[PDB]
Amino acid sequence: KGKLPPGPTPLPFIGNYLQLNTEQMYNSLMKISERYGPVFTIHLGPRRVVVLCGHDAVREALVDQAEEFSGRGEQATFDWVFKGYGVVFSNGERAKQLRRFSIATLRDFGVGKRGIEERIQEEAGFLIDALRGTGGANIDPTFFLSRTVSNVISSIVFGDRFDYKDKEFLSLLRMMLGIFQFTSTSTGQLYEMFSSVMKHLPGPQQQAFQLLQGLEDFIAKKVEHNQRTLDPNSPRDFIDSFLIRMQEEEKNPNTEFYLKNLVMTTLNLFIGGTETVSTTLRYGFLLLMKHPEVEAKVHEEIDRVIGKNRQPKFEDRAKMPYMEAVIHEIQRFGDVIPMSLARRVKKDTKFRDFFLPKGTEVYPMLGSVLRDPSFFSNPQDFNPQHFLNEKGQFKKSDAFVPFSIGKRNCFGEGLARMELFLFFTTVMQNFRLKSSQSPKDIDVSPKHVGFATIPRNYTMSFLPR
Ligand code: HEM
Numbered sequence: 001k002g003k004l005p006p007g008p009t010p011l012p013f014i015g016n017y018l019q020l021n022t023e024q025m026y027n028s029l030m031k032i033s034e035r036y037g038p039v040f041t042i043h044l045g046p047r048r049v050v051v052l053c054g055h056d057a058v059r060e061a062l063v064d065q066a067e068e069f070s071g072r073g074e075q076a077t078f079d080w081v082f083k084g085y086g087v088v089f090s091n092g093e094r095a096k097q098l099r100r101f102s103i104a105t106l107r108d109f110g111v112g113k114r115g116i117e118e119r120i121q122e123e124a125g126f127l128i129d130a131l132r133g134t135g136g137a138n139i140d141p142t143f144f145l146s147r148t149v150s151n152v153i154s155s156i157v158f159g160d161r162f163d164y165k166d167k168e169f170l171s172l173l174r175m176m177l178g179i180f181q182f183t184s185t186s187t188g189q190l191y192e193m194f195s196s197v198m199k200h201l202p203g204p205q206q207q208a209f210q211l212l213q214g215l216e217d218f219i220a221k222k223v224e225h226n227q228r229t230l231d232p233n234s235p236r237d238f239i240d241s242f243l244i245r246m247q248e249e250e251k252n253p254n255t256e257f258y259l260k261n262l263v264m265t266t267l268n269l270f271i272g273g274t275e276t277v278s279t280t281l282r283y284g285f286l287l288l289m290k291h292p293e294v295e296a297k298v299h300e301e302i303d304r305v306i307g308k309n310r311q312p313k314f315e316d317r318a319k320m321p322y323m324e325a326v327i328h329e330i331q332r333f334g335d336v337i338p339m340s341l342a343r344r345v346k347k348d349t350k351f352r353d354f355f356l357p358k359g360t361e362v363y364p365m366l367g368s369v370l371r372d373p374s375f376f377s378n379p380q381d382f383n384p385q386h387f388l389n390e391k392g393q394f395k396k397s398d399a400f401v402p403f404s405i406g407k408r409n410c411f412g413e414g415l416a417r418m419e420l421f422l423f424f425t426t427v428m429q430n431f432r433l434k435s436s437q438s439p440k441d442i443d444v445s446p447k448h449v450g451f452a453t454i455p456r457n458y459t460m461s462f463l464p465r
Pocket residue numbers: 072087088089099153268269272273274276277280336337340341342343402403404405406407408409410411412413415416
């Protein structure tokens with residue numbers, strides 16, 4: 001045909017706003033998909049976006065035409081502070097440079113190696129101490145989890161961990177939780193369509209901007225301190241490494257290594273490496289309380305393979321297919337970043353007999369892949385069997401895409417998987433979970449879904465085993 005994917009007819013400026021519900025963007029798009037097909041065009045306000053639903057559409061685009069779909073689209077709330085700088089929201093040469101440097105630097109600081117594994121085990125031990133500190137009292141686990149997770153990436157980018165009592169640290173965590181919540185609310189999704197007017201109006205979006213500004217200021221302050229104490233031959237952390245590269249590049253007028261990219265990249269890693277893992281852990285504990293029989297099975301596996309004395313280690317995962325299926329099912333059910341981060345076609349593109357002009361934004365509907373009925377027997381239920389064959393051995397799924405896929409996929413994926421495995425296992429090895437309500441009354445549907453999937457607020461107690 002040589003035309004853009006079909007879709008509902010947009011009105012000037014507002015796009016398809018009248019055919020969408022900002023409080024349930026995912027459901028609004030899936031409903032429209034029923035009518036036009038798995039690949040369709042929607043106009044989010046003035047943004048023309050091709051929506052990809054289901055495994056096949058998503059993989060065909062992001063992997064089979066990986067380079068064509070390798071551009072970065074927008075997320076308006078985040079672009080307010082990033083403005084196209086930094087590794088996540090950048091494009092072209094800038095993205096290419098900052099991504100290659102970031103992956104290399106994370107490796108030099110132990111990601112994917114024994115170095116970061118010992119750092120995560122150590123922090124997991126601090127989480128255990130903190131949980132024993134509650135004496136089995138009913139608590140809100142939110143910041144217990146985020147403080148522990150954040151300290152792993154914080155160790156890498158800032159050189160050391162924050163004290164759990166540090167009040168500025170809790171402040172930063174509140175900013176991150178606050179921004180993920182805002183981008184998942186109806187106003188946050190309304191902002192994705194009308195940022196051109198809303199960025200200048202009073203409202204919830206202004207408080208979200210202040211949380212972002214708060215985080216940027218904190219990073220700019222840490223960078224200044226590292227700067228006036230830097231040893232060019234002995235970097236302490238990600239920031240120092242970047243400063244060193246910036247020194248070497250001072251003679252290149254076209255370098256991507258300058259202050260703004262350092263501040264934005266560091267902020268991307270601090271937020272990306274904190275809130276995503278935190279939200280997954282929080283959701284998973286709630287899911288385990290709703291499903292006690294699954295927790296029991298996890299406990300049997302942990303006691304048999306690891307026992308009660310030594311700390312879990314990452315290699316233990318090879319011997320624990322059940323725990324591996326459970327963590328996969330938590331990320332599949334949790335669907336933390338349901339519409340991924342927008343992509344954009346790098347050049348004029350032919351996709352399934354559709355025409356996608358260069359620059360077209362793309363919404364890979366990750367949640368529609370994680371719940372594809374063609375890949376999981378009961379997509380709407382929490383069931384670790386989705387990741388186990390008949391003998392209870394771990395079984396991979398091509399529809400397991402919570403870190404997305406393709407050329408701009410999550411490069412924090414290895415760190416996240418190690419954190420998820422070591423934190424879930426070390427906590428479950430030491431405690432059994434007690435909910436404040438009968439498992440039948442636990443509501444695991446999400447509190448908000450937009451940019452992220454946020455689970456409902458809850459309290460629980462960690463009882464020593
Ligand atoms: C359970 C945890 C996590 C989930 C579900 C997750 C999810 C994602 C997703 C869906 C994307 C967009 C991929 C795309 O455009 O195709 C992404 C990108 C990214 N993630 Fe993660 N992530 C997680 C953890 C992490 C961690 C721990 C870090 C930090 C080290 C991190 C850093 C990044 C970065 C820098 C990008 C942007 C890559 C680029 O634009 O080239 N993520 N992540």
